[PDB]
Amino acid sequence: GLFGAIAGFIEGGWQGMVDGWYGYHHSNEQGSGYAADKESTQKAIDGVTNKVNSIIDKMNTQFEAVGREFNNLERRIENLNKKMEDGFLDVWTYNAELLVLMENERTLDFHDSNVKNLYDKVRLQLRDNAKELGNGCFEFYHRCDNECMESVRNGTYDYPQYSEEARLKREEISG
Amino acid sequence: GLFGAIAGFIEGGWQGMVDGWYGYHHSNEQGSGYAADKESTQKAIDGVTNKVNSIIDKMNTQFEAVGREFNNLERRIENLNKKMEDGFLDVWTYNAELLVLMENERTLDFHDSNVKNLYDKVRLQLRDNAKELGNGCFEFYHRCDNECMESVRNGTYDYPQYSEEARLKREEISG
Amino acid sequence: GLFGAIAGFIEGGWQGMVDGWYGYHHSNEQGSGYAADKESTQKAIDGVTNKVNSIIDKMNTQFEAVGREFNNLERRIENLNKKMEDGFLDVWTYNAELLVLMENERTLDFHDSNVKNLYDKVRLQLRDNAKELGNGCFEFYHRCDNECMESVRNGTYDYPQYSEEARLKREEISG
Amino acid sequence: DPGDQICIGYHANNSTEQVDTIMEKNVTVTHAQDILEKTHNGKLCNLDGVKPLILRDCSVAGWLLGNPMCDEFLNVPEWSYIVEKINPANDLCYPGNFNDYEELKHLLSRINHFEKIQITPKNSWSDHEASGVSSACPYQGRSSFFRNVVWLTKKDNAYPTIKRSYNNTNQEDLLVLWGIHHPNDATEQTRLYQNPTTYISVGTSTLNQKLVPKIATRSKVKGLSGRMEFFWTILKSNDAINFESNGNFIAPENAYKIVKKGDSTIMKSELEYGDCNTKCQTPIGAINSSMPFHNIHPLTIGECPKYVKSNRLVLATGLRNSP
Amino acid sequence: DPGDQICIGYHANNSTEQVDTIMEKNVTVTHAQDILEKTHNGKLCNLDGVKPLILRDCSVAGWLLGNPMCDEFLNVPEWSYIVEKINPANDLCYPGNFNDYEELKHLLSRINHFEKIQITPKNSWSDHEASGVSSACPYQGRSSFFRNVVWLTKKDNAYPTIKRSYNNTNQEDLLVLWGIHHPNDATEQTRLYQNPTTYISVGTSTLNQKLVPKIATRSKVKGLSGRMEFFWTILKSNDAINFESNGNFIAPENAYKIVKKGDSTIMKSELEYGDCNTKCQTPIGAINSSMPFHNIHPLTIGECPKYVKSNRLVLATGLRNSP
Amino acid sequence: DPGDQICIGYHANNSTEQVDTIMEKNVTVTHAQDILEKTHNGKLCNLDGVKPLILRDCSVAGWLLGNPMCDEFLNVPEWSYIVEKINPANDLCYPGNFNDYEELKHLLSRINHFEKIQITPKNSWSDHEASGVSSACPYQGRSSFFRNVVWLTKKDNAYPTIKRSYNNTNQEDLLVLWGIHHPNDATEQTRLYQNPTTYISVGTSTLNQKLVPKIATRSKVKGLSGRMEFFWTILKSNDAINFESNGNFIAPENAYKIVKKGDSTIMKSELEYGDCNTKCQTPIGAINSSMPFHNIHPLTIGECPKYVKSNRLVLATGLRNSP
Ligand SMILES: *[C@@H]1O[C@H](CO[C@@H]2O[C@@H](C)[C@@H](O)[C@@H](O)[C@@H]2O)[C@@H](O[C@@H]2O[C@H](CO)[C@@H](O)[C@H](O)[C@H]2NC(C)=O)[C@H](O[C@H]2O[C@@H](C)[C@@H](O)[C@@H](O)[C@@H]2O)[C@H]1NC(C)=O
Ligand SMILES: CC(=O)N[C@@H]1[C@@H](O[C@@H]2O[C@H](CO)[C@H](O)[C@H](O[C@]3(C(=O)O)C[C@H](O)[C@@H](NC(C)=O)[C@H]([C@H](O)[C@H](O)CO)O3)[C@H]2O)[C@H](O)[C@@H](CO)O[C@H]1O
Ligand SMILES: *[C@@H]1O[C@H](CO)[C@@H](O[C@@H]2O[C@H](CO)[C@@H](O)[C@H](O)[C@H]2NC(C)=O)[C@H](O[C@H]2O[C@@H](C)[C@@H](O)[C@@H](O)[C@@H]2O)[C@H]1NC(C)=O
């Protein structure tokens, strides 16, 4: 695919995460758990619903056929009439099928763009206070309660405020 | 965006940046400043200009309506003439709106892709001679005059020639 | 392209590689050589073969002109018939020309996305057991035979199995 | 040792729904939206509140002229649209043709309401016989004729020249109908109308017509070698129509006031009334849907979805689902 | 201390222009390009150098036959296109009809110039009276007639048989017009043409026509119950036309040589000349634009943008603008 | 030193194929696929196994009426399509016209085979001379006429009234042809048919026709100013056609049985037979191809590519090629 994320460096989804489309699974001393990133999910539920309404409204003015009748010595214009009406039904049938194929292709790659951007969102936040495992998981270098995990999800995580305990730990691995 | 650069990890554009579409905010000993990357902007103006030329000439052969008159016992063919002409006008009105709707969205994502590729253009060149601050900015582990800055913008930045000073400076921070 | 791989941070293609579209060049003690990633080229051939058939099957129902004759006092409908048939020929000519331009552009960006996803496939496996040179190449921090190279090409590369030999080597450099 | 962790991921579920794209067919997805209505109720219904005019085995010609087997429609109320069978059985009961029939039909599909009136009473024909009848037009086992026109024949042994006129003092326009009889031979001609060489003249502010019978021998149709040929005109308010004839004249008795115009159509269908109500009607059944597309039939009336020839149209709304 | 920096960014401005996409509406952008023309000048102009033929209250029929109220158009110069009102006041002044009118108007849109010539001098009729006139066709307060055809009647008490002929020895083709009068009763037919039973024969290498009057009773139109029916043909270069009649004949006096051929059309509009000039004209105003599209009117003539029904059409050229 | 490496890259070759995009033209690529057929063989061939009916210098009317100069076609075999020249030489040899000709030609495009039969023997006219002949219709150095219709004239000094009937007892439907003669003056009318005032009646289960001659003065065509006007009808199996006439009647001799209906067309071409074979034929040459599109001619018959007005259509299959 166009993306590398869904069915990529992250393989498979979480059946246990049933609150949104995108979010977090954390695993520390205070047990495990899931959390949905609403903001990125909100732009996604709003983004796709804009799409489906625009396509419906672009099609409200579309060819409508009406019956006309002809006698036995009007074969030529009867044939004109039939070929013209058939012609428009083929044109608009092509227009709808091809449009659904094209926007299906973008919709799937759209969710995918949002997964990679969210992953890149936190990788840019933590930096050298964590390790990239390479499958969507980050194992960081200090301890995080149930208000630290919260600080990254609302994007406030102060990097140097945890740099030291981390600095100690990566030197301990460097031992 | 679909790439994460515009309105993403780099926030907002620079009103002080008025020489191109994409570029740099540089800050060394010789003060502050703005600078445009010329090379990538030409391929960008050429790209949008080809698009609009392709979009116009693809529409130059299009249905033209002609007035035709019918008497009072030609209501059937009068009606045929009207549906056929109305029919072609809705088809080409649809064709023109949908093509502009589609290529707008791709034009915006073409700019987003071009910024990210530019960001990765300097990031792949510097590596550990600088740090990603997380906002599009790179802070060097050494000092860069106004002749170092140029070598990255024309893509010649000699890495090993400055690797030691950076490595020393970074160990000083890691102590 | 929209991804930066082909004609981007990777420059030029390899004429000597004649078994696939995307792949690997290895350089160890057992000489050099070229090698194609079969898996990604096949899914790439399947995508394009599906596309070209889809474009053919979407055009199988298309307007067909039939000859009709009119006498010297049927000029209005002779003109109607001619314009209706010419009208459909202009519409289906536009549909085929434009579909080809659009899918050409996406086909080219499909290969571009596929080269970069293969690159991140390898970058994610090695991490700090190798270095990004910035041109599509990885310089290892240990030794790779003709069975280590193979473990990376099929994605079985065991990381901790080389974590130690490597970590020491970069310290010799970073000291 | 393992420290604390955090991971990024996406939703999956037990969906099995598939969408298509141009590079790949049958892709399973978490959430999808079908946008194609594929079902109808198989009935003919009211459009909004308004009932259609459902002819049975009667054709448009049969109704307006008043074929005796079509007495159900002698006075119909306002309709919303009209339904007619492919090959109605009760058409022109006496053999012949209906001049400019297809143009009358097109006019009829721009009309929602007629109000029938009598313009020349059957008891005004005092020098001719106004009781013509044929076995090709039966009513209750006995011979009859069209109810809205009259077959005039000789009285005593004479057919005086007819001069009759009618002025449309109504505010709305009138649909007027009449005919001419073509006999089989010279002998039959003199028995019916006495005079051997005849004509019919009809005049209006815009109509200027002259008809002469064609006397000759033709194949038998329902046992008859004679023919009847019918005509129509629209008589505008405050105009007058003029008839003059010395034989073979099938004269007007009733005509129609055009009371309301609007969107209507003539549907070709074998169905009958279904005692239901809808906002979208097709020849094979009605539609109650919110889908933007449908694929049931191209000839529809009312507030409907758009027609396409597709078997499937389903949109991906969610994301790709893990096997 | 902080060392040196370098940052990545894009252009921004004080722009407020907005474009649309399928996922998001009213997105404000730094650079955009309009491609839809929405303004016209509201007048009728010359096309290139060439002035259009603007009939005022005249129709094509009024013009070509020579309605007495249309003497303005007795000899018109070369035109670029023709402008006509929806319901012109000077049409057929004597009530009746113009045969194959719409086909003739269609022929007219490949013609840019007529050159009128005489076929039969008004003083060449020495055995008929050639001065028929009617109050339905007034000129300056008195009774008159069409100028390009002549109304012949009996002289003394006779209408001898007419045999008249013409060979088109010109290089170009000829548009020839003629007619027949339908009286109200036998007395008028005798009063005007003496012979009770009459005909008109017209022959060409390809035309073989025979007309007979239809004498009958009709409504009064502008006080009259008589009717006139007009006919036309194109006479090929080097062919000949032959006329024969013993009554009811409205003979040709003038005919038209088609001297210049090209592209033209007939526009329906209420406007009058505007002393302006354009290369693209519509029925409600002219266009001076460079946009690839316009949305004024579907019927244009000249070198024009393509017509679409959009209210707005703007293309994103720049990038998304920061709030 | 440099250690061990592994690098990622893509395919290149020495190809010269170019593709176009919406943002960029002439992009060189490793692999491309042509989808537009641009070549034809310039000949007229059989369609599958079946040979076409190639009229030479004969037109369809000439063939069907049996112009004595089209005797090659008196009895043709089953055909796949029909080839007719733009301006055929052997058409109506006696000047005149063919009624509803273009509707008949349209009917013919649903027919693959005729079988000619004789319905009225030339020796059945015992009170008329059935040997009419003209110098405009030559045969072998002598004057002749159309073979499928017969020119009847007076015998001794009389022309009795004809009452003749034919019942189509064939299983298949019949194409029946007939005509009427328009003389130049009353005198010629008397030497050929004796009676001054004549008519022709034709009747069927659906047809009720009456023709009257138009005696008049016309230009000479091929030295003649007389005219012949022809008519046609399709007589259903087991129906009958009835003729009644006292002059100017061009009676049927041979008629055509519709033996096979199917897909056919009438092509306009100047070319001649080429003893070849194809499955796709156009008026200017045949096509043997596997491309999904072609640009040779819009008028084709058989199993063909889709027609477009493009000069080039090439699809990108590979990637961009490095110099
Ligand atoms: C219409 O007039 C043309 C030309 O003028 C005539 O030619 C003189 C001989 C004489 O008849 C003059 O009084 C006329 O004005 C005429 O064409 C000519 O016909 C004559 C007689 O055959 C020949 O000279 C020649 O055929 C032709 N001359 C020229 C210079 O073209 C037309 O009659 C004839 O036209 C030609 C083209 C043939 O088709 C011939 O059969 C035909 O009768 C005349 N139109 C008609 C319908 O008679
Ligand atoms: C039918 C009837 O009784 N009409 C009465 C009037 O007679 C007619 O009225 C009209 C309108 O007022 C005209 O004057 C008619 O006269 C003309 C005409 O057209 O103006 C006079 C022309 O000179 C004459 N032209 C020729 C060449 O003969 C023309 C024609 O004869 C007819 O048009 C042929 O169809 O008629 C006139 O005939 C009457 O004047 C009025 C008042 O008394 O009352 C009406 O009832
Ligand atoms: C149909 O009958 C009506 C009713 O009488 C006629 O309209 C009236 O006629 C009177 C008598 O001259 C006159 O006051 C008006 O013309 C009209 N009055 C009203 C109140 O409507 C009508 O005759 C006349 O109608 C006008 C419009 C015009 O055609 C005139 O020439 C005509 O005689 C009758 N219509 C016809 C066609 O005879």
Ligand SMILES: *[C@@H]1O[C@H](CO)[C@@H](O[C@@H]2O[C@H](CO)[C@@H](O)[C@H](O)[C@H]2NC(C)=O)[C@H](O[C@H]2O[C@@H](C)[C@@H](O)[C@@H](O)[C@@H]2O)[C@H]1NC(C)=O
């Ligand atoms: C054409 O000839 C055929 C052959 O005889 C007629 O069909 C037969 O007509 C006889 C006469 O009454 C009768 O036995 C049948 O009607 C029929 N029999 C057979 C074996 O075919 C035909 O005339 C008749 O055709 C039928 C269909 C019906 O319309 C009847 O009314 C009619 O007399 C002849 N065609 C015509 C037009 O008369």
Ligand SMILES: *[C@@H]1O[C@H](CO)[C@@H](O)[C@H](O)[C@H]1NC(C)=O
């Ligand atoms: C897609 O799935 C449907 C579901 O039954 C199946 O019938 C069809 O054959 C499938 N198409 C392909 C190309 O496998």
Ligand SMILES: *[C@@H]1O[C@H](CO)[C@@H](O)[C@H](O)[C@H]1NC(C)=O
């Ligand atoms: C988009 O902007 C226009 C102009 O400012 C405004 O009229 C319109 O209402 C906006 N869109 C919506 C959905 O309101």
Ligand SMILES: *[C@@H]1O[C@H](CO)[C@@H](O)[C@H](O)[C@H]1NC(C)=O
């Ligand atoms: C693209 O290349 C072809 C190959 O010669 C050339 O004919 C054509 O002119 C080129 N395109 C343009 C726009 O000139």
